[PDB]
Amino acid sequence: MQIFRDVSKLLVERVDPKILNLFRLLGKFGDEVNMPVYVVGGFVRDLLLGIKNLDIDIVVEGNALEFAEYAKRFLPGKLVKHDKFMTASLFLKGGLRIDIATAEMSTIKKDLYRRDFTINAMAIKLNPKDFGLLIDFFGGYRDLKEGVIRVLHTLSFVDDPTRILRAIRFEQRFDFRIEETTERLLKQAVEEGYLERTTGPRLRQELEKILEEKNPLKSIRRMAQFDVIKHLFPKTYYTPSMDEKMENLFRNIPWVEENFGEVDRFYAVLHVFLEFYDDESWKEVRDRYSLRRNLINEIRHVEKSAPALLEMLSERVPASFVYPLVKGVSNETICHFLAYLSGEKEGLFKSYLLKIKNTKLEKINGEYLIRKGITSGKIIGEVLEKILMKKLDGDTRDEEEILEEVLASLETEGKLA
Amino acid sequence: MQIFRDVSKLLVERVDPKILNLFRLLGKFGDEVNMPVYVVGGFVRDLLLGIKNLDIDIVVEGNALEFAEYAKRFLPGKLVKHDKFMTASLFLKGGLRIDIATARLEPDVEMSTIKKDLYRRDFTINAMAIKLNPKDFGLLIDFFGGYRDLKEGVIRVLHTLSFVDDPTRILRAIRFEQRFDFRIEETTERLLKQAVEEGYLERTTGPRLRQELEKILEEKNPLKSIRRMAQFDVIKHLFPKTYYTPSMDEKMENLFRNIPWVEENFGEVDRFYAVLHVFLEFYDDESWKEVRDRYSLRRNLINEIRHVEKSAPALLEMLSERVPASFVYPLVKGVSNETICHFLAYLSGEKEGLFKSYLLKIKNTKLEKINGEYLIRKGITSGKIIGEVLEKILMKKLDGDTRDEEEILEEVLASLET
Ligand SMILES: Nc1ccn([C@@H]2O[C@H](COP(=O)(O)OP(=O)(O)OP(=O)(O)O)[C@@H](O)[C@H]2O)c(=O)n1
Ligand SMILES: Nc1ccn([C@@H]2O[C@H](COP(=O)(O)OP(=O)(O)OP(=O)(O)O)[C@@H](O)[C@H]2O)c(=O)n1
């Protein structure tokens, strides 16, 4: 179809002036040193979708270093010269970095063939002669305009399997869908075991992004269809009974964040993903990605403590009984428990969660009062804890609490004196 | 010669990047908004001379306003349009101004129209243009050999009637000669001398002339500019009763020699007014008004001028014999800074000296600090008497050292007597 289009009007309309002047200027610098200058990637895409974008990715046909230095004489900022990739980055002020990379000059075609998705292909030339020129050898404009995610060629995934997760994140991100031939090509690489053949850090960064994106649940369930879950983490199985927890997790994570603070979504997920894990299955998952020595312990905790919790929620036990299972736990671990709760139990587990968060306040009485009482050692802790454990269900004068509490220890023997 | 040169290399090497950027931008706007864009006039001259200029003249072929609004959309400044005789002026944060104008015929004949705009100008060195539009960024456009005239240092009008069209250029040409060390060439000198001989100065308006003179006096060597003026006879043709003779010219030298000393002691000196204090001395009431209402001069000028013009000889005798300083005060009383110059205009060496000191003594020590107009409420109420008493004790104090009060009771003998 059409390779060229005049987004020149669209540039001045959408793009902030301070930036336009940059594209304008960068283009002129191009001419001055004889290098075609293009802005590329996610900016082209975003400008087209009316979505704001500050990233200003740039390709030249010459030498990014030579160009980047020329640019600096007239642009104000820090020049970082990533030799060995012939890349560069001019750091201006206001919070702006121009990423400058290196490549019928249309060698930019070969450069745009190397990418993931037609909508992320495409380039806009910058040299004054061709200033507003949209370049689209692969009909990104078309897919962009009918919400499509096409992987430029049949080896896109083989060449880089991380695009498997990217493809998925883009769907939720822009609301687009993956056309058939990609869909087919994805599965093939997943099943070919291709993304196992890839590094931890890489698969994980991308995994994090998916979770930080618009809709997480939907993209995990999506990830499920394609059977990538099973291929990142060798033992997990996305069943109606694993999913269901996942749903629970994401429904109240907002509550967790509201009363307890940040929730590391990645981890919150691993919890449900990583359950029922033999030691040889974890020392690696943990090892391949970088999970926390021991995280395994914490998932187990909820895993094990789990059938006891709903019972404990049924039978409306006093909070005194719940504490043991949520005592210095992470927000992720709290989330994990919540993965189990539908409806009325939820309001309760939460109802105790705020009791246990609060009223932990001993007010007067601890540490001191006890040692003046003349007690020492690890005991102090247990007596303190067992006072508070009852202050969460009904309060006296917080002294009389001990004078009743130490007694309970006496005539069962507790220290001496 | 070469009508077209590529000075792109100079632009980047010799031009401050913030400006050299604004050029690139102004030229890109041009292409966007479809209009050739040039910088012209003074800047191009100065650039090629390696001189700094922050008054950038841009000429566009198209609407000037249109282009200016379109520029601001993308620039950080204040925009004043000037609607009739379309031209715009863009004030930028950097402390500089873009002056934007429509070329005005009202590849395709782009050069014709700009050449029309250039031919319209005063001198070759100022009739140059540099194209900003990206396609031709470096482009120096020089039809009239203004480039070669820079290197040769030559000043040259563009065509035979350059002076007939704007006789005010008679003065500009002398200015640029003293400003850069250039010499007005033969032909334009021939031409310059007619315009003045025939009377194109009297034919040009007063106010334009005065400004152009003020400019000549603010520039680098005014004495030279005035002498060059006198060599072309242009002085008689500005002021009909002033004859620039060895005497007047000695006065002028002494004047300009002293202005500086006078500035760093009495402050701003209007040099156009000082120079008039010489040009007009011994003017008659009639020829004075004539010239006053012609250059919108101050009305009590003539009195001050007559004041020196009448006492100069007295001042000369006083500074002779070294007459003590009580007697010269009344000559310098409450007079202009220029009036102070005008005197100095008559002086050189040793007299200039002793006269310098006097004026110090006079502004320097006129304290009367101890008394006031209280000491005078101690016995006297007359509106003129209070005022004379005071100016009386002053002069006593002007070259005499004594307490204060006790000289009042003392010189009040010369007063209570008679
Ligand atoms: N594994 C990858 C990563 C990136 N790209 C290409 O590089 C461009 C820029 O990478 P990135 O900045 O991550 O693109 P976006 O997804 O739009 O940016 P973000 O990840 O922040 O959303 C993409 O548009 C894509 O063309 C690719 O082909 N293969
Ligand atoms: N009588 C005049 C006055 C000006 N010009 C043109 O208009 C330009 C701008 O006028 P001006 O600002 O006075 O130029 P400069 O002499 O450089 O500025 P200045 O007088 O302050 O030195 C000049 O370069 C010249 O091309 C002209 O041709 N005829």
TrEMBL record, chain A:
Transmembrane segments: none
Any one Gene Ontology BP term: tRNA processing
Entry keyword set: ATP-binding, CBS domain, Magnesium, Metal-binding, Nucleotide-binding, Nucleotidyltransferase, RNA-binding, Transferase, tRNA processing, tRNA-binding
GO molecular function annotation: ATP binding; metal ion binding; nucleotidyltransferase activity; tRNA binding
Residues bound to ATP: 45, 115-116, 120, 160, 163, 166, 169, 173
Positions annotated to bind CTP: 45, 116, 160, 163, 166, 169, 173
Binding-site positions, Mg(2+): 55, 57, 99
Family: Belongs to the tRNA nucleotidyltransferase/poly(A) polymerase family.
Protein's name in the database: tRNA nucleotidyl transferase-related protein
First-to-last residue of the parent protein present: 437 to 863 of 863
From TrEMBL, chain B:
Binding site for Mg(2+): 55, 57, 99
Positions of ATP binding: 45, 121-122, 126, 166, 169, 172, 175, 179
Binding site for CTP: 45, 122, 166, 169, 172, 175, 179
Signal sequence, renumbered to the chain: none
Family to which this protein belongs: Belongs to the tRNA nucleotidyltransferase/poly(A) polymerase family.
The protein's name in its UniProt record: tRNA nucleotidyl transferase-related protein
Organism: Thermotoga maritima (strain ATCC 43589 / DSM 3109 / JCM 10099 / NBRC 100826 / MSB8)
Shown segment, full-protein numbering: 437 to 861 of 863
